[PDB]
Design a protein around this ligand. Structure first.
Ligand SMILES: [Mg+2]
Ligand SMILES: [Mg+2]
Ligand SMILES: [Mg+2]
Ligand SMILES: [Mg+2]
Ligand SMILES: [Mg+2]
Ligand SMILES: [Mg+2]
Ligand SMILES: [Mg+2]
Ligand SMILES: [Mg+2]
Ligand SMILES: [Mg+2]
Ligand SMILES: [Mg+2]
Ligand SMILES: [Mg+2]
Ligand SMILES: [Mg+2]
Ligand SMILES: [Mg+2]
Ligand SMILES: [Mg+2]
Ligand SMILES: [Mg+2]
Ligand SMILES: [Mg+2]
Ligand SMILES: [Mg+2]
Ligand SMILES: [Mg+2]
Ligand SMILES: [Mg+2]
Ligand SMILES: [Mg+2]
Ligand SMILES: [Mg+2]
Ligand SMILES: [Mg+2]
Lengths: 136, 147, 225, 53, 128, 187
RNA sequence: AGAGGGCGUGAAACCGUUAAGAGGUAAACGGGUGGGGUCCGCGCAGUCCGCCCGGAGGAUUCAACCCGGCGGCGGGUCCGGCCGUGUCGGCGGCCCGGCGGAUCUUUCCCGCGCGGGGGACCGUCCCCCGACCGGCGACCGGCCGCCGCCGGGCGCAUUUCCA
RNA sequence: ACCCACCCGACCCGUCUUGAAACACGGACCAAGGAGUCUAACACGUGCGCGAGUCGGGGGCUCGCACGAAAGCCGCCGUGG
RNA sequence: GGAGCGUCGGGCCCAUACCCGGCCGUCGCCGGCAGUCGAGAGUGGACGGGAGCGGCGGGGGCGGCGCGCGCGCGCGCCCGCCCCCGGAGCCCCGCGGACGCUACGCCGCGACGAGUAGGAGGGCCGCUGCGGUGAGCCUUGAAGCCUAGGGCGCGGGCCCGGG
């Protein structure tokens, strides 16, 4: 099941990382990096995962089929969205809400995408803001 | 697992759980079963009634195999045989009654605890109880002595 | 489906609001009666004496039913018979108090704890001030402040006691249902006596604070409540 | 000294027994050695039963 | 213009000084590190007036602001870049410490990545 | 300062099972929920028993389960046992039963199913009856363990019948001064 | 050589000095403030950001829509077929289904009343199709609805970017 | 958190003791070392497996052991406890 | 002419005691939450005929069980409707459900907290080695050492800066 294998995994997984009074989890398709039942990519029959695009521009959503897990090669199905921020969110929203897929997730999936589109903020602009650089 | 044991948690504390009025000295009672009569008597005669004293007859060269006589109760006599002897019987219509060699299964005596199902038998055994005999007859069977 | 249910839910809503109104009105009239009852009690004690005094006579009024009992010394070095009675009056901490109905049994229990308590016959006002300022229910064994009558009712409403006012009338007149209203009240945690005491260790009669001071328990109440 | 209920029990560790403790760390090495030696003896008694007589 | 945390309440501490160990002052062999005394007579262990204090759970921090740095964050000791990307979805509540043992080349690699993701770093201007 | 004894303020009952096994712990998650959300006290009793020790949930023999359902009226029901169902070789004819158990031994399983019996797991019982309706909640004999024969008024304490811890029974292991009248005295 | 032949690292006790501070109730300590130092964070305004909105400037293509393609989800008609649970029918695998049995038979066979193997029988495990039911995350195929991506269409009261 | 000042508080620890700041003992200072272990037997508690059974030893069959002196299996599965 | 003694007033002084409030922990609550109405709860809902301003014309009770935000109603026009959240717009929503849900988690209410000998629990306290595991760290500097540098933790301790 989901729950059974969460019992096996909850405290032992290689992906987990305690330390410094927090805990985290590094398994893929965990938006929110939580060592939670809810937010765990590997356990659930239906899964969401919002990674950045390898291009450096844009976001990828990562659904999981249901067709056939057992066959991880075919299980996840990726989809780049490289659109005008506000649009990107909405496409993710619909993917999640209007497909009735992992409805629990969804707002977390939006915030992730949002943060990713923040990431691709401008590094040069940040440098200018921190230091006035006036009159030596 | 020392990790789990008590001395890890006693570290720091002086007496190590043995108190500081009285201490952990070596052998304050005497070693072992010392004082069975004097000064440990009460424990002996309120948890071991009858430790001290002889009783009964000596027996010099005891050999246990002479007195070997493992028992079995009617309770579970049919257990000795395959269910399909107890089934091909309550059937058959000859009034046959299947044999149960108890000595084959490793019991010499047949004692008589328990209800025996109304279903004839021939019990071969080295020894029988009185009651075990009676019950067997009441089922409509026959006890059989064997050497 | 939809508009039928909605109206049914609105109907329900209203039937509650009506009932709330009703029970409120009962509470309001119950008080008004108790106002008249205490008035009538007060006057008709004076009435009596004046009438004895008109004749060459005396009106010995009733001995009191009910008394407040404050624990006025601490919890160290206290005899086992005292200590037990003090935890049969629920007077565990120092300066805890309880109402206590009087009778041969009860009075003698106070006699066995005399130099450990100050006590006597509370006023009407005393019963109000104690209940309103420091009225705490025992509600599933959790000391809980009587913020609403929904608390009192929930617990004591099986006796006809449905509000703070009813409670005050049960305590003060020592009704049938006193035991159950009095036990419902968690014992009164009062502060220290402002202006101080006279002497903790000696009896009232002989200058101190302990023992029966009858009328004068009300002064002490005000300086502690 | 005995304390409230238990078998009034006699252990036999009064002689110098730790001088004569016999460990079994051999045993695997032993078990093999027998087994080799066994297979050798077969091979020597060529078509004869390994058993014996 | 540094990274503000989500909520920056008033941390309020019950005790600021270190509890120190009895007679750690008098002797170089005794270390400051707290030890409960277990001595049969002991001014300290029996709570006399005027002595060094004994730590209780009484002094405990408020749970909202326990482990809260002055800045408002909690630390999280990042060890390499991959380990940062965890904090991505916290950033407003946790910051990143970089480890002592991390090299001055890849110390740099972490810092700029945290700057993309807006995770505040607690020892950035350092190795150089 | 207040006078209460803080002596028996902490109740010592279990809360969870002490075991770490994952399947039992799932049953606990299920029956916690049911316990709290249903009115059924069956769920509460069952929940309570899932936290108990091996000792404390003794095996229920098939014959004991038979006779308890043979009782008049509890017919067309389901027997429930938080322990295990074992065989009785000293019973023969096994009626067709309905059973819940955390375990049933392989023999006991065969015998029951051969009869036309149904065996249920505890997750299955919940779906079948979440408020424990139409159940016979049994238990194995708690005081079966040979352990208990040493418990009580000590041996050598008049009118006790309490097995002493003895290395080996036989002519000359106890049965002298303090059991015979001939040797000192007897209790 | 801040590794110099008892030389890797080089703690503490203890000593020398350099700098700072103090000094008649032995010192040292707890609590509480003050003063001074040491560094650390600033600010050469820290007025901190983020949504949405209104106005004002500037800039790319859209979104809304259809059209073509791909991928995904979910659905019932269980429609068609694969899939498997409980039941019933085939006694059909039963010898082309094996093990087990103190069930039987030495009508059998082989080896010497016994051993091995058949042969009955019972228990257990497998084929054939039909019917009912849980139609079960155990899958496919079409159809439907919805979503997303790519490309077509749409050139600008739109949809974006930026200040 | 370094130093200094001041007000209040404040006897030296360890220990045996009814009682220790004691005119009771041990202690100049620092470093490293330094004391409830293991085996056997019992009992109770708890966890797991199987359950009228259970069991593994001892022995054997599988390997030159890289990991193995492991791991696996045994009409020995039960002589036997 | 008390700062003495005996008798008595007011007033004021402060303990870790009492009261109110904060914060930490422990205990208790058949505690709550795996996603729903509902605050002395004292029902909800088919569905069929007969009808309608009818209703259920019961206590100075002072009242809880029955009444004045509607039951039928505004719209389509005496007859019909009284409709669907992929949209009632929401203080309750039974169609789907946390920002919250490491269920060894999270949350709420009360109460309480001296301690030798002794017992038990928890230690994301600490040391050394082993199986796993961190696509860990490390000559672009590991361990150790030192530090009037910055912090965290009630604490065991820990983490960073510089050397
Ligand atoms: Mg001890
Ligand atoms: Mg000692
Ligand atoms: Mg002793
Ligand atoms: Mg006193
Ligand atoms: Mg006195
Ligand atoms: Mg041989
Ligand atoms: Mg002492
Ligand atoms: Mg205590
Ligand atoms: Mg060197
Ligand atoms: Mg050197
Ligand atoms: Mg070297
Ligand atoms: Mg100088
Ligand atoms: Mg002595
Ligand atoms: Mg003496
Ligand atoms: Mg001393
Ligand atoms: Mg002296
Ligand atoms: Mg001496
Ligand atoms: Mg000396
Ligand atoms: Mg050392
Ligand atoms: Mg045991
Ligand atoms: Mg305590
Ligand atoms: Mg102690």
């Amino acid at each position: 099941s989901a729950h059974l294998q969460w019992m096996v995994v909850r405290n032992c997984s290689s992906f987990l990382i305690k330390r410094n009074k927090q805990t985290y989890s590094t398994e893929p398709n965990n938006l929110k990096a939580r060592n939670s039942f809810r937010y765990n990519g590997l356990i659930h029959r239906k899964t969401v995962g919002v990674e950045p695009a390898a291009d450096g521009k844009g976001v990828v959503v990562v659904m999981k089929r249901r067709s056939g897990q057992r066959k991880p090669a075919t299980s996840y199905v990726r989809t780049t969205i490289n659109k005008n921020a506000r649009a990107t969110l909405s496409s993710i929203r619909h993917m999640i809400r209007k497909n009735k897929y992992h409805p629990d997730l969804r707002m977390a999936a939006i915030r992730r995408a949002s943060a990713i589109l923040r990431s691709q903020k401008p590094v040069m602009v940040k440098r200018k803001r921190t230091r006035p650089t006036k009159s030596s | 697992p020392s990790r789990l044991r008590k001395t890890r948690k006693l570290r720091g504390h002086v007496s190590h759980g043995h108190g500081r009025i009285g201490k952990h000295r070596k052998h304050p009672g005497g070693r072992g079963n010392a004082g069975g009569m004097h000064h440990h008597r009460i424990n002996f005669d309120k948890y071991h009634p009858g430790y001290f004293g002889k009783v009964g007859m000596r027996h010099y060269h005891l050999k246990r195999n002479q007195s070997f006589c493992p028992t079995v109760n009617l309770d579970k006599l049919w257990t000795l045989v395959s269910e399909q002897t107890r089934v091909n019987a309550a059937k058959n219509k000859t009034g046959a009654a299947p044999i149960i060699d108890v000595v084959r299964s490793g019991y010499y005596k047949v004692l008589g605890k328990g209800k025996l199902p109304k279903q004839p038998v021939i019990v071969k055994a080295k020894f029988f109880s009185r009651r075990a005999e009676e019950k067997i007859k009441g089922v409509g069977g026959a006890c059989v002595l064997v050497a | 489906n939809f508009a039928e249910l909605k109206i049914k839910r609105l109907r329900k809503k209203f039937a509650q609001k009506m009932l709330r109104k009703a029970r409120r009105k009962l509470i309001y009239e119950k008080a008004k009666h108790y106002h008249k009852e205490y008035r009538q009690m007060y006057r008709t004690e004076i009435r009596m004496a004046r009438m004895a005094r008109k004749a060459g006579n005396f009106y010995v009024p009733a001995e009191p039913k009910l008394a407040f009992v404050i624990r006025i010394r601490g919890i160290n070095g206290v005899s086992p018979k005292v200590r037990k009675v003090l935890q049969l009056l629920r007077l565990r901490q120092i300066f805890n108090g309880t109402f206590v109905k009087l009778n041969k049994a009860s009075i003698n229990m106070l006699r066995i704890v005399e130099p450990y308590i100050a006590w006597g016959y509370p006023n009407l006002k005393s019963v109000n001030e104690l209940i309103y300022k420091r009225g705490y229910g025992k509600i599933n064994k959790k000391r809980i402040a009587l913020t609403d009558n929904a608390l009192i009712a929930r617990s004591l409403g099986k006796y006809g006691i449905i509000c703070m006012e009813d409670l005050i009338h049960e305590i003060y007149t020592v009704g049938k249902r006193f035991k159950e209203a009095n036990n419902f009240l968690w014992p009164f945690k009062l502060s220290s006596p402002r202006g101080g005491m006279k002497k903790k260790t000696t009896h009232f009669v002989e200058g101190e604070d302990a023992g029966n001071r009858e009328d004068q328990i009300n002064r002490l109440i005000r300086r502690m409540n | 000294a005995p304390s409230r209920n238990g078998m009034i029990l006699k252990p036999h560790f009064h002689k110098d027994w730790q001088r004569r403790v016999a460990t079994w760390f051999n045993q695997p090495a032993r078990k093999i050695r027998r087994r080799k030696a066994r297979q050798a003896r077969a091979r020597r008694i060529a078509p004869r039963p390994a058993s014996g007589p | 213009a540094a990274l503000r945390p989500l909520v920056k309440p008033k941390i309020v501490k019950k005790r600021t000084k270190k509890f120190i160990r009895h007679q750690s002052d008098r002797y170089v062999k005794i270390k400051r590190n707290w030890r409960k005394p277990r001595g049969i007579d002991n001014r300290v262990r029996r709570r006399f007036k005027g002595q060094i204090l004994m730590p209780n759970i009484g002094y405990g921090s408020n749970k909202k602001t326990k482990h809260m740095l002055p800045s408002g964050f909690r630390k999280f000791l990042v060890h390499n870049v991959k380990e940062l990307e965890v904090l991505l979805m916290c950033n407003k509540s946790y910051c990143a410490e970089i480890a002592h043992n991390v090299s001055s080349k890849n110390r740099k690699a972490i810092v700029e990545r945290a700057a993309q993701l807006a995770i505040r770093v607690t020892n950035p201007n350092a190795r150089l | 300062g207040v006078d209460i004894r803080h002596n028996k303020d902490r109740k010592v009952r279990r809360k969870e099972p002490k075991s770490q096994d994952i399947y039992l712990r799932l049953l606990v998650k299920l029956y916690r929920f049911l316990a709290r959300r249903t009115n059924s006290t069956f769920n509460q009793v069952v929940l309570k028993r899932l936290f108990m020790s091996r000792t404390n949930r003794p095996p229920l023999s098939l014959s004991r389960m038979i006779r308890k359902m043979k009782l008049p009226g509890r017919e067309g029901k389901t027997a429930v046992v938080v322990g295990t169902i074992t065989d009785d070789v000293r019973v023969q004819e096994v009626p067709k039963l309905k059973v819940c158990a955390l375990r049933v031994s392989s023999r006991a399983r065969s015998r029951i199913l051969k009869a036309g019996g149904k065996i249920l797991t505890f997750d299955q019982l919940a779906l079948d009856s979440p408020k424990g309706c139409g159940t016979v909640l049994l238990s194995g004999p708690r005081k079966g363990r040979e352990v208990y024969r040493h418990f009580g008024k000590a041996p050598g304490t008049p009118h006790s019948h309490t097995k002493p811890y003895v290395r080996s029974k036989g002519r000359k292991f106890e049965r002298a001064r303090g059991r015979r009248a001939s040797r000192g005295y007897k209790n």
